[PDB]
């Protein structure tokens, strides 16, 4: 059941100073550590993408490099999760991350993913309730090896901000969320990711894509929709960070400029 | 767009059950309320049976009670109608006709009631 | 059961002139959702039957401006701006309310 619908278009913005997130579980308190590691860098190009379904294939899978910095303005319900694989088909190993309204799965399995991949909502008529569908998402998961289900961490202007690194068997997901008052969508100032979950994976992952929930329409078999992320890139590099005196990562400057 | 399309036209002697199948697409067939509607030639059009988005499933009209039975197949999309005991008045075109079930978003979606995609007609004839 | 009335029943229209079919029913077609469930079809004759009009006055998809619908309660018409050669054929007015569903008589215009 593998679809095209998603058209997406790109710009370009800057980082300022978003993305920093904790390097590790140890509380410091009123001290600059200086800690190397896979940071985004500061004032760095970052990809703006708008992906628009109107009511052909132009949603391309992006690379993974050494690890994503994923932002979104967007509510919780329109960018569901993401993918994150290689070859993303039935050959190798991929891990899936969907969140919905009660609780997100993260799932690793030998997926068969579409070209376009989206989790579709619909109304079933015998369960008389909108249901959500995978099978818009791929065609097939045999040989499924990995299972994690918890709390979401897409829930309810804001912005939301993920950090991804798949560092020696672990999927690491850092994420923070901020009400960003009427303005720029990537705001000024600091708010350090905290980390969310270590899961331990051991794939190979060098390429990624977002995952967006359409709905059908009741009224061109989906409604028009549309979703905007931001894309920045880690890169190894040393950071000294400002813990202040409840524990919290305030400041931070990047070591070059 | 919904699309309905038919199976073939059949004659046969009273006393067995005839077959006839609705093909959807565009729209799979839980997201649609599903009627079929029989056209006796020289008669108004009348309605045989059909969904109800609520308070139960499906419905029958009284005339057609303890003959008709009506079976959907998700896996192929199929509306499939029977009816035994075929009587000689019972020559006429038979419609299957759809609806969406609902109407709006997942936030604010109300159930909806009609017939709006017809498909074409089969002809049961019951003769010698 | 809700019995619906057409009238007239056959309406002589000549090209063009506006043409207009009374829909009755005896039973109020108010449904506890709030809308009333009232569709208007159009037959041609070796075709199915086709949705004009759905909920009173709504048009459906692919249907031209000059099918009108009109009225509540338990009185309802549906007027034609401009009859053509393409109009010819049976009109129904059915309900989608109370089960079960029923149809008129049918309304059968020409041209001459």
């Known amino acids: 059941q593998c679809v095209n619908l998603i058209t997406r278009t790109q710009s370009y913005t800057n980082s300022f100073t978003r993305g920093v997130y904790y390097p590790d579980k140890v509380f410091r308190s009123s001290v600059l550590h200086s800690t190397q590691d896979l940071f985004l860098p500061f004032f760095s190009n970052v990809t703006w993408f708008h992906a628009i379904h109107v009511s052909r294939f132009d949603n391309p899978v992006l690379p993974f490099n050494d690890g994503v910095y994923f932002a979104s303005t967007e509510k919780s319900n329109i960018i569901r999760g993401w993918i994150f694989g290689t070859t993303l088909d039935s050959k190798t190993q991929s891990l899936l991350i969907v969140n919905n309204a009660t609780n997100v799965v993260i799932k690793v399995c030998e997926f068969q993913f579409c070209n376009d991949p989206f989790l579709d909502v619909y109304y079933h008529k015998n369960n008389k309730s909108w249901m959500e569908s995978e099978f818009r998402v791929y065609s097939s998961a045999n040989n499924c090896t990995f299972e994690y289900v918890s709390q979401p961490f897409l829930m309810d202007k804001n912005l939301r901000e993920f950090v991804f690194k798949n560092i020696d068997g672990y999927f690491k997901i850092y994420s923070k969320h901020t009400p960003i008052n009427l303005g720029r969508d990537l705001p000024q100032g600091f708010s350090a990711l905290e980390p969310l979950v270590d899961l331990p994976i051991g794939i190979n992952i060098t390429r990624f894509q977002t995952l967006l929930a359409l709905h059908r329409s009741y009224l061109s078999g989906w409604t028009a929709g549309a979703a905007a992320y931001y894309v920045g890139y880690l890169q190894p590099r040393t950071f000294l960070l400002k813990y202040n005196e409840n524990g919290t990562i305030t400041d931070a400057v990047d070591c070059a400029l | 767009e919904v699309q309905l399309v038919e199976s073939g036209a059949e004659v046969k002697k009273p006393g067995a059950s005839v077959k006839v199948s609705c093909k959807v697409s565009?729209?799979?067939?839980?997201?649609?309320?599903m009627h079929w509607v029989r056209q006796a030639p020289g008669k108004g059009l009348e309605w045989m049976g059909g969904?109800?988005?609520?308070?139960?499933?499906?419905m029958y009209a009284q005339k057609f009670q303890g003959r008709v039975t009506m079976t959907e197949d998700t896996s192929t999309d199929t509306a499939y109608m029977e009816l035994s005991s075929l009587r000689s008045e019972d020559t006429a075109v038979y419609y299957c006709?759809?609806?969406?079930?609902?109407?709006?978003?997942?936030?604010?979606?109300?159930?909806?009631?009609?017939?709006?995609?017809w498909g074409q007609g089969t002809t049961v004839t019951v003769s010698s | 059961e809700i019995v619906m009335t057409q009238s007239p029943l056959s309406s002589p229209v000549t090209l063009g002139q506006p043409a207009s079919i009374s829909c009755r029913s005896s039973?109020?077609?108010?449904?506890?959702?709030?809308?009333?469930?009232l569709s208007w079809l159009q037959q041609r004759p070796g075709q199915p039957p086709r949705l004009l009009i759905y909920?009173?006055?709504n048009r459906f998809s692919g249907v031209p401006d000059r099918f009108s619908g009109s009225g509540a309660g338990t009185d309802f018409t549906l007027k034609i701006s401009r009859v053509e050669a393409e109009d010819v054929g049976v009109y129904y007015c059915?309900?989608?309310?109370?089960?079960?569903?029923?149809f008129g008589q049918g309304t059968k215009v020409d041209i001459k």
């Open positions: 006709a759809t609806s969406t079930a609902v109407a709006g978003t997942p936030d604010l979606f109300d159930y909806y009631y009609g017939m709006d995609v």
């Open positions: 565009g729209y799979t067939l839980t997201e649609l309320s």
């Open positions: 969904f109800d988005p609520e308070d139960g499933e499906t």
């Open positions: 039973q109020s077609l108010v449904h506890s959702d709030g809308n009333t469930y």
């Open positions: 909920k009173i006055s």
């Open positions: 059915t309900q989608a309310t109370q089960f079960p569903y029923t």
